[PDB]
From a paper:
Serine palmitoyltransferase (SPT) is the rate-limiting enzyme in the synthesis of sphingolipids. It catalyzes the transfer of a palmitoyl group to L-serine, yielding 3-ketosphinganine (3-KS). SPT is highly conserved across species and consists of two large catalytic subunits (in yeast: Lcb1 and Lcb2) and interacts with a small regulatory subunit (in yeast: Tsc3). Here, we solved cryo-EM structures of the yeast SPOT complex in both monomeric and dimeric states and the monomeric SPOTS complex.
The SPOT dimer was refined to 3.4 Å resolution, with C2-symmetry imposed. We do not observe such helix crossover for the yeast SPOT dimer. A marked difference is the absence of the previously reported crossover helices at the protomer interface in our dimeric structure, which could explain why we were able to obtain monomeric SPOT complexes. The lack of the Lcb1-TM1 helix swap, previously observed in human SPT complexes, results in weaker protomer interactions and explains the presence of monomeric complexes. Both oligomeric states from the human complexes are active in vitro; however, their respective physiological relevance is unclear. In all of our structures, TM1-2 of Orm1 acts as a docking station for a 44:0;4 ceramide, which is sandwiched between Orm1 and the amphipathic helix of Lcb2. The ceramide extends out of the cytosol-facing membrane plane through interactions with two aromatic residues, Y110 and Y485, of Lcb2. Therefore, the positioning of the 44:0;4 ceramide headgroup in the immediate proximity to the conserved, substrate-tunnel-gating PATP loop and its direct interactions with Y485 and Y110 of Lcb2 effectively blocks access to the substrate tunnel from the membrane, highlighting a regulatory mechanism of ceramide-based inhibition of SPT activity. Our data show that in yeast, Orm1 does not regulate SPT via insertion of its N-terminus into the active site but rather in conjunction with ceramide.
Author numbering:
A (entry chain C): 8 to 561
B (entry chain B): 52 to 457
C (entry chain A): 39 to 221
D (entry chain D): 3 to 69
Write the structure that this text describes.
Amino acid sequence: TRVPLCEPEELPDDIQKENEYGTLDSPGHLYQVKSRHGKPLPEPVVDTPPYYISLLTYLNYLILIILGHVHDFLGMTFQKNKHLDLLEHDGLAPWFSNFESFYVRRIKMRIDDCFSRPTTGVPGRFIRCIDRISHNINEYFTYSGAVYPCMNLSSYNYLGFAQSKGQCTDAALESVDKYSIQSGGPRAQIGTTDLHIKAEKLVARFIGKEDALVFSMGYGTNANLFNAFLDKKCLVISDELNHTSIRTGVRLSGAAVRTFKHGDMVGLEKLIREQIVLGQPKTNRPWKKILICAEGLFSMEGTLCNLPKLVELKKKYKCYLFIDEAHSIGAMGPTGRGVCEIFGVDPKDVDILMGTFTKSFGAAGGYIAADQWIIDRLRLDLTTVSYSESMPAPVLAQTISSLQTISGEICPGQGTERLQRIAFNSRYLRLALQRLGFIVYGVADSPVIPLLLYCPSKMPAFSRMMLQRRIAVVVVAYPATPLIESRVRFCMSASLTKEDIDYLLRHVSEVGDKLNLKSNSGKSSYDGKRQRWDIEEVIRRTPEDCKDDKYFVN
Amino acid sequence: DDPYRTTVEIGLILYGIIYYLSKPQQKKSLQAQKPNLSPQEIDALIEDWEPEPLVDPSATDEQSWRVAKTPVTMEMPIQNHITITRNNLQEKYTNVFNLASNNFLQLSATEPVKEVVKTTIKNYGVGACGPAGFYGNQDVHYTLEYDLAQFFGTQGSVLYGQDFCAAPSVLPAFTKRGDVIVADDQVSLPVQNALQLSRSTVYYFNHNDMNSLECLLNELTEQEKLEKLPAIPRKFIVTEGIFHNSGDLAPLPELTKLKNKYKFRLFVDETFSIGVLGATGRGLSEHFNMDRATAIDITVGSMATALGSTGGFVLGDSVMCLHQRIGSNAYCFSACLPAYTVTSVSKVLKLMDSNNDAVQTLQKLSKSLHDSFASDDSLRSYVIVTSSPVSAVLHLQLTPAYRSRK
Amino acid sequence: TTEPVKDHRRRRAAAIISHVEPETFEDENDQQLLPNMNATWVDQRGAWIIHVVIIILLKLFYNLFPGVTTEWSWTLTNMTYVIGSYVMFHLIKGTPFDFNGGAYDNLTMWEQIDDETLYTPSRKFLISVPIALFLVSTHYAHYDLKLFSWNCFLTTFGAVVPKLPVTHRLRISIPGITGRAQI
Amino acid sequence: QHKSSMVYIPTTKEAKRRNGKSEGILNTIEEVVEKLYWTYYIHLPFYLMASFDSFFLHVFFLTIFSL
Ligand SMILES: C[C@@H]1CC[C@@]2(OC1)O[C@H]1C[C@H]3[C@@H]4CC=C5C[C@@H](OCCC(CO[C@H]6O[C@H](CO)[C@@H](O[C@H]7O[C@H](CO)[C@@H](O)[C@H](O)[C@H]7O)[C@H](O)[C@H]6O)CO[C@H]6O[C@H](CO)[C@@H](O[C@H]7O[C@H](CO)[C@@H](O)[C@H](O)[C@H]7O)[C@H](O)[C@H]6O)CC[C@]5(C)[C@H]4CC[C@]3(C)[C@H]1[C@@H]2C
Ligand SMILES: CCCCCCCCCCCCCCCCCCCCCCCCCC(=O)N[C@@H](CO)[C@H](O)[C@H](O)CCCCCCCCCCCCCC
Ligand SMILES: *Cc1c(COP(=O)(O)O)cnc(C)c1O
């Protein structure tokens, strides 16, 4: 009835090191990416399944919605004593009403076993999971205190910096020995140390800006950044697929919001022109300023933003640009600088650059980079700096070690191998999956490979069947996604090797053949012919051909 | 007659055709709104528009002095005796006596805790690599949640990644348009942000005044009774344990009596009172010798001020926590805490359970500090003291006469 | 009485006929910040043939029982489709998923379709389908005006009447028959 | 290579071919039945439902076929 505390396992050094990070097999399994030099980015193309799949999806959702209301009505009307949470006891309203919790109770409840799974130990290329047994219908669980390893394709460690034995761990332990774990307070009265300024300058030099700021949390950074310089008389133009933190920050700021469709620039230009002409509502006076918010790389889709067009538009119409890049600051680029490196765009064109250390550097926190005359004002106008706690010492040490490793200072040739490994793994997996006959999204280099499952009842079967094979995956669905399109999101890491990918390919091929999940058309291959290759031929021929940049449609 | 039935069909078909032939129109129309414009004219408007600078740089040199005055500690943990430098290494001081630290009990610096952190770092790594929703939640987090719930006498608890963003993510979750909130006259900034984001009616009553609260509650009750609304809405009272800016405490028993009489819920934000108030240090409720499970409904706390590690927590019953695990924005879309923090805080809680010397020593020191300044006569004409004898922080204010004269 | 600093109070109608008050600046920002998911799925792929498939299946299942009469079967399938459409579109007000604050607490889905833009192709299809069904039912088999008048009355007042622009943003509250509606 | 602490789960085809379970005379019918059952069960909501409602829907489909 309670989560047991698991005793650590005692193993020799080599076995644990292999569990955390995998050794390379052959030096031919590396790939070095090349710059784009500014050539235009083509419009993405998406494949579609047949009609009957969509019709069945519509019928499934309709039946589920009808039955949910039938049960809700009958149970609320007759059996009152059982449902005491949703009724007022003595002049006090319930914590929540039945209507807003309909989706959680009626459809999501039957799937609660595939969402939250306790684990233990360091998340590497093999993750240890706690075994649990379900009672009633996912109401409560009973734990037998047994653990077993699984392959993880769901954790945010792109460069494999999550280790228990390494230079970063040594630096963290030394920092703990030198600086205590406790801080003083807000970074305006006490709590600033030389390590903070060192990290500031290191991040500023690594990005390419002139000055920066470091915060202890990323969500708070976004939620508190916007109100410092925006007001009711300003306008914010943002995409329709931005993160929640940006939405909360803009809501707190109080400015007006206009949104444009994903990937459309003609609509963006038309919206900018119209908004400039019309002016403020009900008074038709000109706006004080206009700001453009976008994201470097979108995790739900695995697609890039067309930065040069945004820069051109902001130069022509005299607007400001804000770029959010947390998934692409360390894992993408010829040297890992970010989205500004692949396109060749000068960093000075963008106004504000933000990112977090959680995804790639193995430590928690976030930052912001801009010009000197902006940072000087912001250090005074920000509310995080003078009201909230400061960043601890071990996290700073880990971040500094990771940054100096990637930059090539502390160790000669460790970061480049990681970049090449992650690039090759992503390309190989995407090409093999597309040659099998599935449907994937991406731009041929993103670490996110979303494979689409359309029927509502196929996601739990896929999750459970992959668990039985000792593989851990994460599946998302409504409303986080469009109603028709559900998907499973793969997060590729540098710690995995090629044989693991072959094992995964065999198992996923068998499961997809069983569940009828592979439905491909001619719009996904370069020759225009639907392809269903046998597995051994795929394994034999894909790793050599994945290097050429012509086999990929987008 | 038969032609009447055909005429009905004709009338339906005609309206269908008429609606089909029409063109789309929207209230939020395009440039054609005014329009009274031509392509040549629009370019003039576009070119005439001039923007404002992103930030105003006029006054930065006037406030740079406060940036130049920030102390910095070099190569040493923040402790009682430190060495500081100011104004970018131009001036240096040594053997400084620190009276600005915000850590009260100083239990995190002892040897028995420094081993739990090292072992945890060796066995787990530094940072978690996933959200609590998918795969990030581990066994140590559950252990800390159970320990907090057992220690503070509440059914459950929820862990947050930072204490600044706890209230603005909890309070809006349980309120909607059409609800009432009664807040104190002066509250801290995070509570103000929560109230702004809550999107509900807000009423204010005078500071530490019970007559005003009673009168306003009676007026609201009478108006609601006269309104005859079919569904009862939610009601909350927002206050603070020990105020951040003035260092004064709130009277709990009167609030409990009023909330029981007028059917209101009580929300208490106690960041500066968790580790210092009470004989054992269990919070505000222990000071007045009352049960927490009935006196208070929602509690917001911080682990940084007294316990000595980053994070925050919220205490409540089972339904609240179960709904909070899905309806809270800062909880869902964020990564989990590192393991060494939670292990160290659990060890500190066990140490607090073992012995209770630090609380007594701190209370004695605070009483001495208050009496020393509040017992003199020379400073009667210059400054006044706005803090309580039990607070660990002393606040000083200039006399209103001095402010006007100077 | 004491005046709140920030007031967001729901107000109900006070007359037999009334209209909902236009939204404010903050409400407009709240609605524009996040796309609505209840009204987006109508325009997507495969969302139009579904009604035809439902009609075809309802005809077959009601005709399957030997004891039914063709006129009665078509009237019953009209009952089913009209009642289902009225319940889904015009009866229920609100959003199952939670938006910022109250948000779309006062408008129905038909009002939420396509950001309140009128004369959209989806609206044309949704208003044309019941008419085509009615004419097909009338012409298909023999009928008598007795049930025919009531059937066309129900088709008009349950499917056609709510779709007119005159009834847009409109609320009717009988003093006792129907509860008061928030404006 | 280097050994690790992972336990590999064999695939279905390998287990079947190493178990000698495959028999041409009396396995094609079983495979056909398996395909017919799974295709019927997956593409239609039985897997997120309750036992009473699932049984009711099974009886409904069975009666529809029988009629
Ligand atoms: C073969 C056979 C044939 C026959 C058959 O079986 C098969 O065929 C079957 C086919 C069935 C129908 C299928 C589909 C529906 C739609 C459904 O849709 C409800 C959705 C609405 C809510 O309904 C739920 O919640 C209600 C909560 O009151 C429940 O009501 C009371 O239920 C109990 C007493 O009945 C007691 O507990 C209490 O007295 C009270 O809870 C109700 O039962 C429950 O359903 C959503 O809309 C509202 O949302 C808010 C509610 O939260 C309202 O309030 C808000 O108002 C302001 C906005 O203006 C906000 O600002 C304020 O903050 C805020 O207060 C808002 O006004 C309004 O829009 C209503 C039921 C119906 C017609 C079914 C009937 C039964 C059948 C005929 C079966 C049948 C057996
Ligand atoms: C003796 C015999 C006498 C016969 C008497 C006849 C009596 C007729 C009884 C009618 C029973 C059915 C009436 C209501 C059943 C359906 C009502 C469901 C409404 C529940 C709440 C709706 C909330 C909408 C929010 C929502 O989740 N929206 C969407 C997603 O975001 C939604 O989830 C999806 O888009 C799916 C809906 C699309 C499926 C196509 C439906 C179109 C045709 C309707 C015909 C209904 C026929 C029923 C057999
Ligand atoms: C992952 C994600 C976050 C998460 O914030 P943390 O507090 O660092 O976990 C923030 N911003 C973006 C864009 C993200 O994708």
